[PDB]
Write a protein that binds this ligand. Structure first.
Ligand SMILES: CC(=O)SCCNC(=O)CCNC(=O)[C@H](O)C(C)(C)COP(=O)(O)OP(=O)(O)OC[C@H]1O[C@@H](n2cnc3c(N)ncnc32)[C@H](O)[C@@H]1OP(=O)(O)O
Ligand SMILES: CC(=O)SCCNC(=O)CCNC(=O)[C@H](O)C(C)(C)COP(=O)(O)OP(=O)(O)OC[C@H]1O[C@@H](n2cnc3c(N)ncnc32)[C@H](O)[C@@H]1OP(=O)(O)O
Lengths: 206, 206
């Protein structure tokens, strides 16, 4: 009949997850219309994302789903949840996000984040560089669980804020963020030094 | 006669510098018209800013000036520079920023920053939370030296970008940043979860 049962898990990524992280970021570059900025490599992620313990620096939570439940127990333990969703999900790219041949596990989303600092609170926070759910799985609460995971971690460590940026035009994301209780601030603009501009400072003698 | 000699030093802050850091942040809250957000304490900065080695996490460079030169040598060594500036500087609040009675050293500015991550480059960068020069010392190149110090560090560690935010209206800062070669991006807006909004996620069971 119409509905079916589905299992979800949110866990920390390991370096072995780099292929799926890479692909998710790519899909974000496509959605953001910023593929011209996308030069990420798998070896780059593997080399730079995991040089510290989780939560101390760059950290990733992965969301996986499955029709079969996960194994028992394999500063954080995974969140598990059981969903009643509709018939099968149409996910053509499923094979691109499957850790295993003999397996119906699929990576459905992620969040990538790290400690920032609020000057004015004298308190660390978390900044979310990426949060993303693949198209087939949207509007089912998964983005909520991902943001909730980071928020809870922040409250647990007594951090002052969680922050990120959103595109001007991205109405759907903005409604999501406001529904989660975020304020969209109008007064700040991002400033960036990069490329030749950055490199030029290597010669400057002051 | 009109001009005089002046010595500058840029060094890493230690926890002992917290009083001056606190006061600088306060002046920024005043300038930004955001004193209503200012709840920083000295004990908060001392407790949260120095839990890691420099450059691994939250890091501060202080700018000090003096009419007398600094002592000899007391991943980084301090930058020193000699300036020919005009008569005395009128600095009423000088005593608030002086490390020592018997001493004409004064803290004139700072930058507070930490590692961020560019998804799309798969490369860490630095994010500047604060950069500031006190009023009496502006338009003398000191902001340039401060930004240069962070930029050089980034190039040395092979980071992809240096970034920060600027207020909408802050024409003088924007001209400064553009002169340094930064691009001011128009499309990003900052999103923030904080206060009760953040705390509420402590009860949420998902
Ligand atoms: C660079 C940028 O500007 S954005 C980069 C990432 N943002 C993106 O837009 C990428 C593409 N989209 C996504 O990844 C996802 O849609 C997310 C992460 C934004 C949201 O995650 P989802 O799992 O789709 O959202 P979730 O189901 O948890 O939605 C929570 C609530 O948001 C609110 N909401 C309102 N409008 C919307 C909307 N258009 N889309 C999603 N949620 C919405 C609803 O109250 C919803 O609850 P409901 O399903 O009962 O109506
Ligand atoms: C939240 C926000 O939006 S901003 C928070 C921090 N920003 C602030 O505005 C705080 C108050 N101001 C300051 O702290 C300082 O003015 C800074 C940090 C912005 C700049 O540092 P300074 O030491 O004043 O700048 P510096 O002397 O290095 O200026 C470099 C170049 O910027 C360019 N520039 C152009 N217009 C300006 C301007 N109005 N102010 C400063 N530099 C300017 C010039 O080319 C200048 O070189 P020049 O002196 O030969 O003309």
């Amino acid at each position: 009949g119409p509905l079916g049962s589905m299992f979800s898990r949110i866990r920390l990524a390991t370096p072995s997850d780099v292929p799926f992280i890479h692909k998710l970021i790519h899909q974000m570059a496509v959605f953001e219309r910023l593929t011209h900025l996308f030069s990420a490599t798998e070896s780059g992620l593997a080399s730079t994302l995991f040089t510290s313990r989780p939560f101390q620096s760059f950290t990733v939570f992965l969301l996986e789903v499955s029709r079969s439940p996960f194994p028992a127990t394999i500063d954080f333990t995974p969140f598990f949840k059981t969903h009643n969703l509709d018939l099968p999900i149409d996910d053509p790219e499923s094979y691109n996000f499957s850790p295993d041949m003999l397996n119906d596990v699929v990576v459905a989303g992620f969040v990538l984040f790290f400690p920032n600092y609020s000057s004015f609170l004298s308190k660390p926070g978390f900044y979310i560089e990426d949060i993303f759910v693949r198209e087939p799985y949207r509007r089912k609460g998964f983005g909520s669980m991902l943001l909730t995971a980071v928020a809870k971690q922040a409250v647990k460590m007594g951090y002052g804020r969680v922050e990120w940026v959103v595109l001007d035009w991205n109405v759907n994301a903005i409604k999501f963020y406001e529904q989660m209780g975020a304020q969209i601030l109008q007064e700040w603009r991002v400033c960036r030094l990069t490329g030749d501009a950055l490199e030029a400072f290597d010669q400057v003698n002051i």
